[PDB]
Design a protein around this ligand. Structure first.
Ligand code: ZN
Lengths: 293, 734, 207
C-alpha cells in the first residue's frame, strides 16, 4: 500500500495466452511468479513465502505512468445518468472499448461523465522470426515496444527483500522472451500521491474497484459475484520448473480481471494451481488491493 | 399446442387474397378472395374463417373464433391504424433524401442477376403477377397443416413475395413487402395467443374487438434479443504455420453461423414459436418477438443457462450467448419516437449488463476445481479435453470436427443429429450431408444453404456467402493470363460497410420526426442487407477466379487472384451503391501478396489496410499499402477506368517506350519534390522528340496529359497516376 | 553466491547489416527487403534473438560434443537447463549523432543488387536496405551467477569470449555470405550490477 515501483520497460512480451499477442499489463501473477523464481536462485524462497502469507505485503498489476499514475476503467461505471446524438453514442462505443486506462486526476471526473479519447502508448508490434535450415521454423513474437514516456508501476508494500527482488528484476527480465531481449527494465521507486494513498483500501465496503486479478475465498464469492461488474481472465499456461524433465500445464485458473467493480469488498487467496503429482507448489497470486470509487 | 397451428396459418395467410385481386383486378376485399381461393387447394374452416373475419369491415357477425386475434395481429402489423404504385425501396426514407426508387415486382432465383430499383418502375404492372400467382398455387399444391409443412411455406414467400407491395392505397407505410408484413403478423399472433392463453382468458370478442384499446396498452410483447460474444476472435484463432489454411476459416465462420441459427431455432421450440417470430438473425445478434409472460421469461433464463453450460463445456469462455428482453405494449405505432428507441434500449442494456456479470457462484467454483493433470495441449485452442493424434500432432475435439466440417462444407444440406460431427447445442451435433444420403440418417432439423426450392423434407433455408472457383494455392498461378500478362500474386479484400451500427441504431430516424424508424422497416432493411451480402455476392463473383472465404453482416473477406479481386471489389461497390441508393458507403482494403504466404500474416495486414481505409474518411479503398488510399468515388472512375484505360490505350499502340519509361515515371511520381516537376518537364520533352517522328502526337497528347496530372496541385490527381502505373506494370509483367 | 555481471560493448559495423522482418508490400520503386527497425524512433536495431541464435549456432560448431552450450543458453527438454544462465538485449544504435558528426544523410542505405541467369543471361534486380557502415550499437549481455553456477564460471568465460571472438569472424546478419556482416566489438567491459562479486580479474581476459 506504500510506494509504487516505476519500471521502465522499452520492450516486452506479455502473453495473453499466445506467442502472437501481448498484453499491456501483467495481471500481478507475473510479477509474483518473477519474485518467487528469482528468490530461488538466491535461496530466499521460504522467507518470501512466509512473508507472502501475511498482510505485510500486497501486490498490484501494472498500469501506465505517462507523467502520472493510471488505473483501469471502472468496468460497468458510469451508470445510467441523455437522449441526444443517437449517432454520437455509437462513436464512443468503439473508442471506449479501447479506453481501459484512466489517470488519477480524472478518474473521479470520468464517473461524473467525460470522454478521454484514449492516448497511445506502447504500440504492439509483431515481428517474424525463424530457426533457419530446420523443419518448422516460423513463429511470431508480438513485442510491446513502449512509447518513450511510459512506465509500468506495481503498487506494493516496501520491504527490503522486496526491494532486493524488484531490483534483481531490473536485469533478470520480466515478460515473455526474457532470454532474448524482451521485458528488461529499470526501476525507480517514487511517491504515491496523497489522493492515491488514502484510497487503496482492503476493507472499505461500498462501491469499490479492484486493482489486481484476485480470486475471493469460496465463502465470500457468492455475493462477490452478486453485484460485481467484472471480467474473467483465464490465467493458465505451463508451470515453469526445474524438477520435471517434461513440461506440464498449470491448473486452469479463472480470475476477476483488474477493473472489476465490487460492492462490499472481499478477501483474496493464493490459489495453489499445482499439477497432479508435482513436487513444489505453484502459487498464482490472487489477493486484492482496492480503490474506493 | 393443438389450435396454434391453424391460427398461424390463418393470420399469416390472410391478405394473400391481396395477390389474387391484384392479379385479376377485382375490387372485392381480400378477406373474401383469399378465403375463397384457399378452399380450392385445401379444406380448413379454421384457416378460411380466419382469412374471412380478419378485416372486420366486410362481415364479422358470425363469431369465439381465432378470428379476433387474426384481427388484432393485423392491426399491430402496420405502423398506423390499418393505388397503382409498386413497392417502394427501403432507402427512400433511409438517412438522406434522393430520388425515390421502386421495385420491379418479380420473384427470386439462385443464378439470378440482381434486382436493383429505379424511379422508372413507379406505375403498376398487373400482368407481371401471373408468374407469381400460379407459383403460389402449384408449389403449395398438395399442402397440409403441421410442423413438417410449417416452415417451407416461409421460404416460399421469400423467393416470391419479397418484392410485392402491401396496402397500395396509403402513403406512409409503403416500403414494407408482403413477405415481411405477413411474417410480422403471424409473429405477433402467436405472441398474443401465448400471452392470453397463459393467463386463462378463453374469449376474444370482449377482450380483442371492443376492449382492444385497453389490451392495446397492456404490456404484452417481449422484444427479445440475443448476442453471441466472441465470434470474431473465434474465427481468427489461426496463427502462422497452420494446416487448414482457409478451409478452417470458411468452416469456422459457417460453424458460428449455424450455432447462431440453432439458437434462434431451438429457442422457439422450447417456446411455442416458429421461424416467423425471429425478426432478424445474423452476425451474432438476433431479434425476436415473444409473449410477455413468465412462461417465456423462465424458459429464456433456463435456456440461456443451459446453453451457456453447453458453451462452457467445450469452448471455455471463448464464446458466450447473452440474452435480453424489453417489454412493451402495442405502442410502437404512430411519445411515438421515444417508445421504439426505449424498448430497443432495454434489451441492449440487459445484454450489456449480462456481458459483464457472466456466471453464477457454482459454475465459477466448478470452473477452477482443479484435479486436472496435463502434459499436452491443443496448439490451436489451448484446451485439454479429448486430445487425439490428428496428422502427427495433438488436436482437440472441436478442431477435429472442424476439419470434418470443412470437408462437408461443399454440400447443400446440413442436418443436426445427436452424435455426428460438430456440437452446436445440448445434445445436438451438426453434420453436413448430400441430398441422397438423407434417407439413411435421422435428422431433427435440416438447413439448406442458399436455395429457394421447395425442398424434400420441408427444410429450413439459410443463407451463407459461398464461392470457390479453385484452390487457394492455385490463385497466384491463375493470375498469369493467356500471354503471361500478369504478376504472380494473389490479393485479399476485406470489405466492410461503414457505420453499420449507425445504420441499425438510428438508421431511419434521419428522415422525418422519428416516425420512420419502426419495426417493419428495420426487419426489412436487415433482410435486405443479409440478402445482399450473403446471396448476391456469388452473382458478382460468378465468373471470377476467387474464393469468398467469409461474407455477410457487413464484413467480407475474400481471397483470390488479383485482377479478379480488384474487379470484384469494383463490381461490389458499383452494385451496392445501386442497391443502397448511394447511401451506406462501404470501405474495402486490398492487399497484394506473394504465393505461399500464410493466411494469418495475410489476413492481419489486410485488416490493418482496411481499418486505415476506414480511418482515411468515412469511405475509402486502401489498395495494396497504407499510402495508396483513395475513395471509391474516385478509384473506380478515375484510377481504374479513366487513367488506366488511357495508359493502356497509349502504351499498347506503340512499340518504342517499354517498361523502362513506366518505371522511371513511377520513380518520379514517388520521390516528388517540386524540382521533380522540372525534371519531368525535361524528361517528357526530351522523349517527345526522341520518338519516331511519324507517330509523335500520340506521345505529345500523352505527355501533355501526364504533365497535366503531375502539376495539377490538388494532391488527388497524382497518386491516381502512380497507382494506375503500378496496376499497368502489374498487368504487363512477363 | 549470487550476482549479475553484464557485458557492455559498442558493436561496430564494418560492412552493412541486413536483418529482415515481417514481409511488407513493395510498391515498385520501394525497397523489397527492408531492414527491421524500432517502431517508435524509426531507427535500425539488432534484436536480441538474432544474437542469441547467432552466437549459439557459432559455438555449436566449436563445442559440438552440447552440455556447455545447453547450460549457457538453455535447453527446454533438460530439467537442469530450462531458462539457464544468459540474457541478451537489443542494440539501440548509440551513435545516432556521431553519424551526423561524421556527416551522413539517412541511417540506412539501399544497396542495389541483381540476379543473372546462366541460360538467358538476364538480370533480375533487388534492393536491399542496409544499416550503414561504422554505426555503433549498445550491446550488453547479462550473465547471472547462482549457486549451481559455481565452480564452472571459468569455462563460461573462455566460451563467451570465445563466442565474441567468433562474431568478428562470421557475419551476424542476413545475406552474410555476400558481405553484410563484419561486426566488431569495442569497449568490451564486464561490470557488475546487483551483486557482490568482483570482475577485475575477468576484465583483463577481455581487454
Ligand atoms: Zn478448439
Amino acid at each position: 500500500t506504500y510506494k509504487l515501483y516505476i519500471m521502465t520497460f522499452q520492450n516486452a512480451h506479455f502473453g495473453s495466452g499466445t506467442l502472437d499477442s501481448s498484453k499491456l499489463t501483467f495481471s500481478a501473477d507475473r510479477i509474483f511468479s518473477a519474485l518467487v523464481l528469482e528468490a530461488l536462485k538466491m535461496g530466499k524462497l521460504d522467507a518470501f513465502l512466509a512473508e507472502a502469507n501475511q498482510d505485510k505485503f500486497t501486490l498490484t498489476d501494472a498500469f501506465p505512468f505517462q507523467f502520472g499514475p493510471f488505473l483501469p476503467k471502472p468496468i460497468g461505471y458510469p451508470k445510467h445518468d441523455q437522449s441526444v446524438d443517437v449517432k454520437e453514442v455509437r462513436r464512443q462505443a468503439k473508442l471506449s472499448k479501447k479506453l481501459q486506462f484512466l489517470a488519477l486526476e480524472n478518474v473521479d471526473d470520468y464517473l461524473n461523465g467525460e470522454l478521454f479519447e484514449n492516448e497511445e502508448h506502447a504500440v504492439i508490434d509483431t515481428v517474424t522470426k525463424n530457426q533457419p535450415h530446420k523443419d518448422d521454423n516460423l513463429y511470431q513474437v508480438a513485442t510491446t515496444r513502449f512509447s518513450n514516456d511510459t512506465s509500468l508501476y506495481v503498487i506494493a508494500n516496501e520491504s527490503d527483500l522486496l526491494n532486493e527482488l524488484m531490483s534483481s528484476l531490473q536485469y533478470s527480465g520480466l515478460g515473455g522472451k526474457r532470454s532474448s531481449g524482451f521485458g528488461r527494465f529499470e526501476l525507480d521507486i517514487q511517491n504515491i500521491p496523497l489522493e492515491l494513498s488514502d484510497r487503496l483500501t482492503k476493507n472499505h465496503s461500498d462501491k469499490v474497484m479492484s486493482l489486481t486479478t484476485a480470486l475471493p475465498v469460496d465463502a465470500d464469492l457468492e455475493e462477490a459475484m452478486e453485484d460485481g461488474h467484472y471480467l474473467l481472465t483465464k490465467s493458465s499456461g505451463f508451470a515453469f520448473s526445474h524438477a520435471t524433465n517434461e513440461n506440464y500445464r498449470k491448473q486452469d485458473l479463472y480470475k476477476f480481471a483488474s477493473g472489476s467493480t465490487f460492492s462490499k469488498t472481499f478477501e483474496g487467496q493464493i490459489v495453489d494451481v499445482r499439477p497432479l503429482d508435482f513436487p513444489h507448489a505453484v502459487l498464482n497470486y490472487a489477493k486484492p488491493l482496492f480503490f474506493k470509487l | 399446442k393443438k389450435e396454434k397451428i391453424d391460427l398461424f396459418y390463418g393470420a399469416l395467410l390472410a391478405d394473400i387474397g391481396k395477390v389474387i385481386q391484384r392479379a385479376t383486378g377485382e375490387r372485392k376485399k381480400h378477406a373474401l378472395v383469399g378465403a375463397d381461393w384457399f378452399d380450392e387447394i385445401a379444406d380448413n374452416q379454421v384457416i378460411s374463417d380466419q382469412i374471412r373475419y380478419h378485416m372486420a369491415n366486410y362481415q364479422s357477425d358470425k363469431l369465439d373464433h381465432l378470428a379476433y386475434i387474426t384481427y388484432i395481429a393485423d392491426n399491430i402489423a402496420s405502423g398506423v391504424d390499418r393505388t397503382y404504385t409498386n413497392q417502394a425501396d427501403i432507402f427512400n426514407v433511409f438517412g438522406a433524401q434522393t430520388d425515390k426508387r421502386y421495385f420491379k415486382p418479380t420473384v427470386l432465383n439462385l443464378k439470378s442477376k440482381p434486382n436493383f430499383a429505379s424511379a422508372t418502375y413507379e406505375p403498376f404492372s398487373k400482368g407481371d403477377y401471373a408468374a407469381i400467382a400460379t407459383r403460389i398455387k402449384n408449389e403449395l399444391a398438395e399442402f397440409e397443416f403441421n410442423q413438417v409443412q410449417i416452415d417451407s411455406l416461409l421460404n416460399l414467400f421469400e423467393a416470391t413475395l419479397s418484392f410485392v407491395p402491401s396496402s397500395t392505397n396509403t402513403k406512409e407505410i409503403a416500403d414494407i413487402s408482403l413477405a415481411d408484413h405477413s411474417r410480422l403478423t403471424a409473429a405477433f399472433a402467436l405472441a398474443i395467443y401465448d400471452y392470453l392463453e397463459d393467463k386463462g382468458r378463453h374469449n376474444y370478442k370482449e377482450d380483442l374487438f371492443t376492449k382492444v384499446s385497453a389490451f392495446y396498452e397492456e404490456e404484452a410483447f417481449l422484444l427479445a434479443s440475443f448476442d453471441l460474444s466472441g465470434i470474431q476472435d473465434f474465427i481468427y484463432n489461426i496463427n502462422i504455420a497452420t494446416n487448414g489454411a482457409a478451409k478452417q476459416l470458411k468452416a469456422r465462420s459457417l460453424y458460428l453461423d449455424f450455432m447462431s441459427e440453432y439458437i434462434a431455432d431451438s429457442l422457439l421450440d422450447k417456446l411455442g414459436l416458429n421461424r416467423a417470430n425471429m425478426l432478424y438473425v445474423g452476425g451474432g445478434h438476433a431479434y425476436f418477438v415473444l409473449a410477455n409472460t413468465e412462461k417465456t421469461v423462465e424458459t429464456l433464463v433456463q435456456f440461456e443457462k443451459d446453453f451457456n453450460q453447453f458453451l462452457l463445456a467445450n469452448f471455455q469462455t471463448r464464446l458466450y450467448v447473452a440474452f435480453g428482453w424489453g417489454s412493451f405494449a402495442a405502442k410502437d405505432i404512430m411519445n411515438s419516437p421515444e417508445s421504439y428507441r426505449q424498448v430497443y434500449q432495454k434489451a441492449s442494456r440487459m445484454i450489456s449488463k449480462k456481458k459483464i456479470s457472466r456466471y453464477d457462484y457454482q459454475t465459477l467454483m466448478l470452473l477452477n476445481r482443479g484435479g486436472k493433470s496435463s502434459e499436452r495441449e491443443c496448439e490451436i485452442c489451448h484446451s485439454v479435453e479429448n486430445l487425439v493424434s490428428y496428422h502427427d500432432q495433438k488436436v482437440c475435439d472441436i478442431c477435429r470436427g472442424l476439419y470434418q466440417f470443412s470437408k462437408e462444407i461443399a454440400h447443400d444440406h446440413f442436418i443436426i443429429t445427436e452424435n455426428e460431427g460438430l456440437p452446436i447445442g445440448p445434445n445436438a451435433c451438426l453434420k453436413g450431408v448430400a441430398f441422397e444420403k438423407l434417407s439413411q440418417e435421422a435428422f431433427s432439423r435440416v438447413y439448406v444453404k442458399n436455395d429457394y426450392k421447395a425442398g424434400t423434407v420441408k427444410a429450413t433455408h439459410v443463407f451463407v456467402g459461398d464461392y470457390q472457383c479453385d484452390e487457394i494455392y492455385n490463385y497466384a498461378a491463375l493470375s498469369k493470363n493467356e500471354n503471361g500478362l500478369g504478376i504472380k500474386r494473389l490479393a485479399v479484400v476485406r470489405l466492410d460497410v461503414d457505420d453499420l451500427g449507425a445504420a441499425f441504431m438510428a438508421g431511419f430516424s434521419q428522415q422525418g420526426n422519428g416516425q420512420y424508424s419502426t419495426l417493419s422497416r428495420s426487419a426489412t432493411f436487415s433482410r435486405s442487407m443479409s440478402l445482399f451480402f450473403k446471396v448476391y455476392i456469388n452473382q458478382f463473383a460468378s465468373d471470377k477466379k476467387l474464393s469468398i472465404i467469409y461474407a455477410g453482416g457487413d464484413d467480407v473477406f475474400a481471397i483470390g487472384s488479383w485482377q479478379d479481386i480488384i474487379a470484384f471489389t469494383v463490381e461490389l461497390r458499383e452494385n451496392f451503391i445501386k442497391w443502397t441508393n448511394g447511401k451506406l458507403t462501404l470501405s474495402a482494403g486490398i492487399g497484394l501478396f506473394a504465393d505461399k504466404t500464410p493466411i494469418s500474416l495475410m489476413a492481419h495486414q489486410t485488416g490493418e489496410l482496411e481499418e486505415a481505409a476506414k480511418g482515411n474518411e468515412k469511405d475509402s479503398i486502401s489498395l495494396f499499402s497504407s499510402d495508396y488510399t483513395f475513395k471509391f468515388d474516385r478509384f473506380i472512375t478515375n484510377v481504374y477506368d479513366d487513367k488506366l484505360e488511357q495508359i493502356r490505350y497509349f502504351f499498347n499502340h506503340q512499340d518504342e517506350r517499354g517498361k523502362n519509361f513506366i518505371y522511371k515515371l513511377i520513380e518520379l511520381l514517388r520521390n516528388h519534390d517540386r524540382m521533380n516537376m522540372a525534371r519531368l518537364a525535361y524528361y517528357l520533352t526530351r522523349l517527345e522528340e526522341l520518338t519516331r517522328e511519324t507517330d509523335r502526337d500520340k506521345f505529345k497528347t500523352f505527355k501533355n496529359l501526364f504533365y497535366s496530372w503531375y502539376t495539377n496541385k490538388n494532391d488527388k490527381d497524382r497518386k491516381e497516376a502512380e497507382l494506375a502505373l503500378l496496376l499497368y506494370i502489374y498487368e504487363i509483367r512477363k | 553466491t549470487f550476482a549479475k555481471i553484464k557485458f557492455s560493448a559498442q558493436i561496430r559495423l564494418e560492412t552493412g547489416l541486413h536483418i529482415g522482418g515481417s514481409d511488407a508490400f513493395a510498391a515498385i520503386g520501394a525497397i523489397n527487403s527492408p531492414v527491421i527497425k524500432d517502431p517508435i524512433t524509426n531507427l535500425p536495431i539488432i534484436p536480441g534473438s538474432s544474437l542469441k541464435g547467432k552466437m549459439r549456432t557459432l559455438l555449436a560448431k566449436v563445442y559440438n560434443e552440447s552440455d556447455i552450450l545447453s547450460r549457457l543458453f538453455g535447453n527446454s527438454k533438460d530439467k537442469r537447463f530450462k531458462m539457464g544462465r544468459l540474457i541478451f538485449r537489443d542494440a539501440f544504435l548509440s551513435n545516432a549523432d556521431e553519424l551526423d558528426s561524421l556527416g551522413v544523410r539517412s541511417y540506412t542505405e539501399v544497396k542495389f543488387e541483381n540476379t543473372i541467369d546462366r541460360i538467358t543471361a538476364e538480370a533480375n534486380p533487388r534492393q536491399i536496405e542496409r544499416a550503414i557502415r561504422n554505426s555503433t550499437f549498445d550491446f550488453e549481455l547479462i550473465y547471472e551467477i547462482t549457486d549451481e553456477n559455481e565452480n564452472q564460471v571459468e569455462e563460461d568465460f573462455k566460451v563467451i569470449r570465445d563466442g565474441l571472438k567468433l562474431l568478428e569472424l562470421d557475419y551476424l546478419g542476413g545475406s552474410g555470405s555476400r558481405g553484410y556482416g563484419k561486426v566488431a566489438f569495442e569497449n568490451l567491459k564486464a561490470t557488475t550490477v546487483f551483486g557482490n562479486y568482483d570482475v577485475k580479474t575477468l576484465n583483463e581476459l577481455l581487454t
